[PDB]
Amino acid sequence: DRRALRIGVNGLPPSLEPINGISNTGPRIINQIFDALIRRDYFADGAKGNNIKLVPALAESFERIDDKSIRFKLRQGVKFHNGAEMTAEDVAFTFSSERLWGDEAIKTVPNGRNFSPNWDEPVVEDKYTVVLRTKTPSYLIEKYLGSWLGPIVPKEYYKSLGAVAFGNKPIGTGPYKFRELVANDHVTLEANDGYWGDKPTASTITYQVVAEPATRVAGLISGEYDIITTLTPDDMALVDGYSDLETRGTLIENLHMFTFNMNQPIFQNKTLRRALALAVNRPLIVEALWKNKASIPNGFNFPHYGATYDPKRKPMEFNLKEAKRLVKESGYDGTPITYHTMGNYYANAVPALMMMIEMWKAAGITVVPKIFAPGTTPKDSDILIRNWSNGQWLTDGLTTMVSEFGPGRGVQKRWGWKAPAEFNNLCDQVAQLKDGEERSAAFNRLRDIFEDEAPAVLMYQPYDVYAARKDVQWSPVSFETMEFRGNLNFK
Ligand SMILES: O=P(O)(O[C@@H]1[C@@H](O)[C@H](O)[C@@H](CO)O[C@H]1O)O[C@@H]1[C@@H](O)[C@H](O)[C@@H](CO)O[C@@H]1O
Ligand code: NA
Ligand code: NA
């Protein structure tokens, strides 16, 4: 009797294992299959889906012991989708050296250590009591455990499969259970009638890949999808022209960017990276494609960071003439530089690129698009410029300047950014320092090096736009996920 929900999506994640699926496409699926110890109550106090309040979820109760540990008292009688009782053994395994942050774990869960704080091994005190802690002071543990790092996995089942096989047949405690997946096509979930919280309101949820937004909007209009993702503010005119459809959007805690393969000779030094950055007139892109709804950050700095947000920081300058000078100095010889984009996987990716191509022409640089189809992974050696995004997944400046751009992490190790020694020393400091002036001072210097080095160019915080049938009552949240608990009803 419950209605079946059909969501037209931009893509599917590479895995449904909670960490390996961290992407713009994963959380919207992963958040239904799993629960964390702590959950973000996005709509608390009438908030329009952007409240940061963290509430009990698989942890019935929790108390901070000191500056580096929290005791969690677990909800009793919670079952995983395979009938198994969720216990402290499962929570300890989820945040253990074996599964997440140990040397052997990061070979199969590659960002398990990169994204984690300085964990120490969890302590199981009893069946429903577990202490989670860091070796060094950290007032961010609650924030990590309520983020996309937090989903609790079943110990026996996950171990008997391994992270990647688990990622294709996930088992969690969440309100929807995995039914099936067809690679690069769809994922279907079904109501978990054993759920401990709000009873699921959809019989099934199907995430159907419709890579082209043009076809996705047409599918919504023709009655094929109840909700569609990854639209732009300019899609309002077509969608809202229909009385039974509407767009629903919000500013999300994500950053659209372009970055470089710094192993490539032309981008080994900061000179052309900075030239590409200074040639971009971001207010003009935000006015032309985002209806002035996207936000331009003032450095690698967001109000979401709270105590480590710097409101007085000046934004990076649009400086066409200086970009011209930097191009000439760099030795650039007019060779075409490619910019790889998987179509409009990122909302406004292709129109923003075309506007930046004209801005780059004005600076004396030839950039050409290299639009690749879904399921056609280009090799790193073929990449010069590429687009990317970073979810700003903690209310703290550590994510993602440190979690992505820090020492030993992907931008330096895979994409070859030669960060100054000073940057890597300060990344290590902000992880071990408690909230304060020294931590803020270190983030100020890290942001100055980041702006000077330009390993990536921050475009804007997107205004994420969805569209839906007016009979589907659901509000977007300020993050790259979809929340349906207490937020999905039909009629
Ligand atoms: O959707 P994305 O912008 O990037 C995804 C990537 O995560 C995924 O593995 C890949 C193949 O499926 O497709 C995209 O490049 O996700 C980023 C993620 O890469 C990053 O780790 C995270 C935190 O910075 O932010 C996401 O927004
Ligand atoms: Na060249
Ligand atoms: Na949402």
Q: What is the CATH number of the domain that holds 324?
A: 3.10.105.10
Can you tell me whether residue 218 is helix, strand or coil? helix
169 in any annotated domain: no
168 in any annotated domain: no
CATH of the domain at 51: 3.90.76.10
Contact 433, 446 (CB under 8 A): no
| Selection from 145, 126, 140 nearest residue 68 by Cα | 140
Whether the ω angle into residue 400 lies within 30 degrees of 0, i.e. cis, is yes
Q: Tell me how far apart the alpha carbons of residues 42 and 39 are, in angstroms, rounded to a whole number.
A: 9
Distance, CA 249 to ligand 3 centroid (Å)? 8
Contact 208, 9 (CB under 8 A): yes
Distance, CA 362 to ligand 1 centroid (Å)? 31
Do residues 285 and 148 share a domain? no
Q: Tell me how far apart the alpha carbons of residues 175 and 79 are, in angstroms, rounded to a whole number.
A: 11
- Number of the ligand closest to the Cα of 264: 2
Q: Which residues surround ligand 3, an ion (CB under 5 A)?
A: 476-477, 482
The pocket around ligand 1, CB under 6 angstroms, is made up of 13-14, 22-24, 254, 388-391, 400, 404, 480
Residue finishing a domain among 92, 127, 160: 160
Q: Tell me how far apart the alpha carbons of residues 77 and 57 are, in angstroms, rounded to a whole number.
A: 13
* Ligand 1 mutation pick, 181, 388, 402, 458, max ligand atoms within 8 A of CB: 388
| Selection from 226, 215, 272, 278 nearest residue 248 by Cα | 226
Nearest CA residue ID for atom 4, ligand 1? 23
Q: Tell me how far apart the alpha carbons of residues 473 and 490 are, in angstroms, rounded to a whole number.
A: 6
Contact 216, 8 (CB under 8 A): yes
473 in any annotated domain: yes
Q: How far is CA 291 from CA 29, 135, 205, 284, 345, in A?
A: 29, 46, 31, 10, 20
Q: Tell me how far apart the alpha carbons of residues 202 and 83 are, in angstroms, rounded to a whole number.
A: 21
Contact 426, 278 (CB under 8 A): no
Please report the sign of the dihedral spanned by the C-alpha atoms of residue 91, residue 17, residue 216, residue 387: positive
Distance between start and end Cα atoms, the chain: 14
126 in any annotated domain: yes
Q: Tell me how far apart the alpha carbons of residues 473 and 37 are, in angstroms, rounded to a whole number.
A: 27
Can you tell me whether residue 283 is helix, strand or coil? helix
Contact 380, 386 (CB under 8 A): no
Distance, CA 295 to ligand 3 centroid (Å)? 17
Q: Classify residue 97 by its DSSP letter.
A: I
Do residues 269 and 406 share a domain? yes
Most distant CA pair in the chain, distance: 68
94 in any annotated domain: yes
Query: Which residues lie closer than 8 Å to 373 by C-beta, 6 or more apart?
Result: 211, 342, 343
Closest approach atom of ligand 1 to CA 11:
12
Do residues 387 and 305 share a domain? yes
Q: Tell me how far apart the alpha carbons of residues 362 and 320 are, in angstroms, rounded to a whole number.
A: 7
- Tokens 């983030």 map to which residue? 443
What are the backbone dihedrals phi and psi of residue 460, each rounded to the nearest 5 degrees, phi first?
Answer: -175, 165
30 in any annotated domain: yes
- Number of the ligand closest to the Cα of 330: 2
CATH of the domain at 471: 3.40.190.10
Contact 42, 49 (CB under 8 A): yes
Contact 262, 415 (CB under 8 A): yes
Q: Resolution in angstroms, to 1 decimal, for this deposition?
A: 1.6
Closest approach atom of ligand 1 to CA 20:
9
Whether the ω angle into residue 134 lies within 30 degrees of 0, i.e. cis, is no
Q: Tell me how far apart the alpha carbons of residues 303 and 477 are, in angstroms, rounded to a whole number.
A: 16
Q: Tell me how far apart the alpha carbons of residues 269 and 38 are, in angstroms, rounded to a whole number.
A: 43
Can you tell me whether residue 337 is helix, strand or coil? strand
Please report the sign of the dihedral spanned by the C-alpha atoms of residue 428, residue 431, residue 432, residue 436: positive
Residue 295's beta-bridge partner residues? Answer: 461
Do residues 193 and 51 share a domain? no
Do residues 143 and 239 share a domain? no
Do residues 93 and 206 share a domain? no
Do residues 135 and 269 share a domain? no
Nearest CA residue ID for atom 25, ligand 1? 390
Residue-range definition of the domain harbouring residue 67: 35-160
Contact 233, 291 (CB under 8 A): yes
166 in any annotated domain: no
Helix residue ranges, H only, 222-319: 236-240, 270-278, 282-290
Question: How many domains does one find in the chain?
Answer: 3
Distance, CA 285 to ligand 3 centroid (Å)? 23
Q: How many CB atoms lie within 10 A of CB 317?
A: 11
Contact 152, 90 (CB under 8 A): yes
Do residues 468 and 373 share a domain? no
Do residues 267 and 346 share a domain? yes
Contact 209, 186 (CB under 8 A): yes
Distance, CA 478 to ligand 3 centroid (Å)? 7
Please report the sign of the dihedral spanned by the C-alpha atoms of residue 32, residue 480, residue 41, residue 470: negative
Do residues 195 and 320 share a domain? no
- Number of the ligand closest to the Cα of 148: 1
Contact 223, 28 (CB under 8 A): no
Do residues 414 and 321 share a domain? yes
165 in any annotated domain: no
Q: How far is CA 284 from CA 95, 215, 350, 428, in A?
A: 44, 27, 15, 37
Distance, CA 44 to ligand 3 centroid (Å)? 15
